[PDB]
Every structure is written in structure tokens, then in C-alpha cells.
Design an enzyme around this catalytic site. Structure first.
Site, PDB file in Angstrom:
ATOM      1  N   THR A  26       2.652   3.209  -1.697  1.00  0.00           N
ATOM      2  CA  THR A  26       3.307   2.603  -0.542  1.00  0.00           C
ATOM      3  C   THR A  26       2.479   2.726   0.739  1.00  0.00           C
ATOM      4  O   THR A  26       2.544   1.869   1.629  1.00  0.00           O
ATOM      5  CB  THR A  26       4.720   3.166  -0.338  1.00  0.00           C
ATOM      6  OG1 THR A  26       5.566   2.692  -1.395  1.00  0.00           O
ATOM      7  CG2 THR A  26       5.295   2.718   0.997  1.00  0.00           C
ATOM      8  N   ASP A  50      -4.385   2.990 -10.068  1.00  0.00           N
ATOM      9  CA  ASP A  50      -3.135   3.615 -10.492  1.00  0.00           C
ATOM     10  C   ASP A  50      -2.727   3.145 -11.879  1.00  0.00           C
ATOM     11  O   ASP A  50      -2.327   1.989 -12.054  1.00  0.00           O
ATOM     12  CB  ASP A  50      -2.023   3.302  -9.480  1.00  0.00           C
ATOM     13  CG  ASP A  50      -0.664   3.816  -9.920  1.00  0.00           C
ATOM     14  OD1 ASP A  50      -0.626   4.705 -10.792  1.00  0.00           O
ATOM     15  OD2 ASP A  50       0.365   3.335  -9.396  1.00  0.00           O
ATOM     16  N   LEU A 230      10.932   8.187   5.824  1.00  0.00           N
ATOM     17  CA  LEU A 230      11.129   7.985   4.374  1.00  0.00           C
ATOM     18  C   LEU A 230      11.655   6.591   3.963  1.00  0.00           C
ATOM     19  O   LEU A 230      11.177   5.990   2.991  1.00  0.00           O
ATOM     20  CB  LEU A 230      12.033   9.095   3.821  1.00  0.00           C
ATOM     21  CG  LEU A 230      12.740   9.971   4.866  1.00  0.00           C
ATOM     22  CD1 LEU A 230      13.630   9.174   5.835  1.00  0.00           C
ATOM     23  CD2 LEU A 230      13.539  11.041   4.169  1.00  0.00           C
TER      24      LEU A 230
END
Ligand code: NI
Ligand SMILES: [Zn+2]
Length: 272
Positions: A26, A50, A230
Site C-alpha cells: 500500500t 511480491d 491506518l
């Protein structure tokens, strides 16, 4: 904060290393989303070694060994992949030579490194490789150059990501210390999952957090410290969270804006 890169016209390479799934994917997103969003046009193109492929998962589309700018992004493609050197070098120039052909040059890669920590070797292949050659030809000259060219900071800057939690912090200590062995640019790190100022029974967790924040302040003066609130999935949801990546987040804004952004994903409180 990361307005130096959100802006840096001069970078060909940007590694976001953050083995831990700490929304590292992210981070990579938000930097690319924010960079391309800020440098209005001049397509940057986003890969992630990834092995999870959280990235495709991230933007809401499935990518792979092929570029494909995203819907609303006039200037940003994406891509994902999996001896180990084989994986890197060959498929590394897969993307390199791949875009030499696909049309023309294309400006730079947000390189979301593999959380696998295998990306460490992915990052010293050429160093020891140029050695073999210099005491055993096209790519031979290329390695000596690009090796020094990855060393060069105005082209290759790394960037770490953290949660407050101490353990990461230590792995980041040991990590950077290894990075400098490589002699690569690093001066910048983002941190995640932060709460700020009822949910005081949550804030009681930010307390211990807030402190860990200060061990990284004193410990790293040569570095940006991006405090990030967050994991999201939408492009916008993602794009708004980049807005805090660049422009120094702020607990008056942060507040009203993230109160809204959670009520997006269906999150009279409660923990459990
Ligand atoms: Ni519940
Ligand atoms: Zn709470």
C-alpha cells in the site's frame, strides 16, 4: 514526509522494501499513485516482486508479467512476478527490455520489493557479478556502469516501512545497516497503523505506540519520518491515503477524513 520523491523528477528507481505485509504494498501504491498524481503526466510504472501479489489485489485489478495502466490513471502501469539471481536478472531485464520495446522509454519504476526478504540478494547480484568478469562483453560494461548507477542516490533511493512495534524497528535497524553495506540511498521511512488523539481504550495502545515513534526520531535524524494513520482495496480509498503520504498528515484533517474513510469499508464502537 515524502514530498521529495512525490516530486523528485530525477529518480529512475524507487524501491519500497517492507517485508511484513505492513501495507508495504500500500505504501508502494500511494507513492506511485501520489507521484503520478502529482507529476500530472509522465507515466511511472509499478512492479512488485511480491510473491503474494497483494498489489493487483490492491488496485482492484489483476496484473502480471505485463504492464497495464489503471482506470483513472492517465500515467501509471503495474506489474508483478515471483537460481534466485535468475529470477531477478533475467526477469529484471524482462521489464527493462520489455518497455524498451512496448513503445518508448517510460519514466521510472516504483519497485515494491518482495516481502520475502529474498530481495536482498536481488540487490547484490551485480556487485559480486562485475567481480567475476574483471578477473575471469556488452552487458559487462553495462554492469560496472549500472552497478555504480544503482549506487548513485539521485537515481536509486530505497525506502523502508514500519509499524510502531519494536520488532520491526529492530529488523529495520539491521536492514538499513545491510543496505549501507550495499552503499545504496535510503534516507526515508514511513510508519503505519498509527492511531492518534472512548476509543481512548484504543488510545491506550497509541500511548505505547507514540513512545516507539520517539525511539525512531532520535535514532534517525538523517531520515524523513512519515507518520501514517491506518488494508484498503479501492483506487480512491487508496488515492486518498496517498494524500497523507505526501502532504504531512494532520490530526485535525486526519481526524475528519479517516473517520470517513473507515466508515467506507464498513468498520457503538468495539474491539475484540
Ligand atoms: Ni466485531
Ligand atoms: Zn477502542
Amino acid at each position: 514526509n515524502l514530498h521529495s520523491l512525490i516530486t523528485s523528477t530525477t529518480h529512475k528507481w524507487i524501491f519500497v522494501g517492507g517485508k511484513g505485509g505492513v501495507g508495504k504494498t500500500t505504501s508502494s501504491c500511494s507513492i506511485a499513485i501520489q507521484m503520478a498524481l502529482s507529476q500530472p503526466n509522465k507515466q511511472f510504472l509499478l512492479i512488485s516482486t511480491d510473491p503474494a501479489h497483494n498489489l493487483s489485489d490492491a488496485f482492484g485489478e489483476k496484473f502480471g508479467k505485463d504492464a497495464r495502466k489503471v482506470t483513472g490513471m492517465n500515467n501509471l502501469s503495474c506489474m508483478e512476478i515471483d537460481d534466485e539471481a535468475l529470477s531477478f536478472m533475467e526477469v529484471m531485464k524482462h521489464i527493462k527490455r520489455q518497455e524498451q520495446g512496448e513503445g518508448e522509454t517510460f519514466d521510472t519504476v516504483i519497485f515494491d520489493t518482495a516481502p520475502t526478504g529474498h530481495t536482498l540478494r536481488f540487490l547484490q547480484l551485480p556487485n559480486t557479478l562485475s567481480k567475476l568478469l574483471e578477473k575471469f562483453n556488452e552487458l559487462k560494461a553495462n554492469v560496472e556502469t549500472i552497478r555504480q548507477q544503482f549506487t548513485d542516490p539521485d537515481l536509486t533511493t530505497f525506502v523502508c516501512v514500519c509499524i510502531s512495534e519494536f520488532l520491526s524497528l529492530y529488523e529495520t535497524e539491521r536492514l538499513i545497516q545491510e543496505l549501507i553495506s550495499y552503499d545504496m540511498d535510503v534516507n526515508s521511512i514511513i510508519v503505519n497503523q498509527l492511531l492518534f488523539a472512548n476509543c481512548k481504550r484504543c488510545q491506550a495502545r497509541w500511548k505505547m505506540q507514540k513512545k516507539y515513534l520517539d525511539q525512531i526520531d532520535e535514532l534517525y535524524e538523517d531520515f524523513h519520518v512519515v507518520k501514517m494513520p491506518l488494508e484498503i482495496r479501492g483506487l480512491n480509498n487508496l488515492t486518498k491515503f496517498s494524500q497523507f503520504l505526501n502532504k504531512e498528515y494532520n490530526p485535525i484533517t486526519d481526524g475528519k477524513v479517516i473517520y470517513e474513510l473507515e466508515d467506507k469499508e464498513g468498520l457503538h464502537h468495539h474491539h475484540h
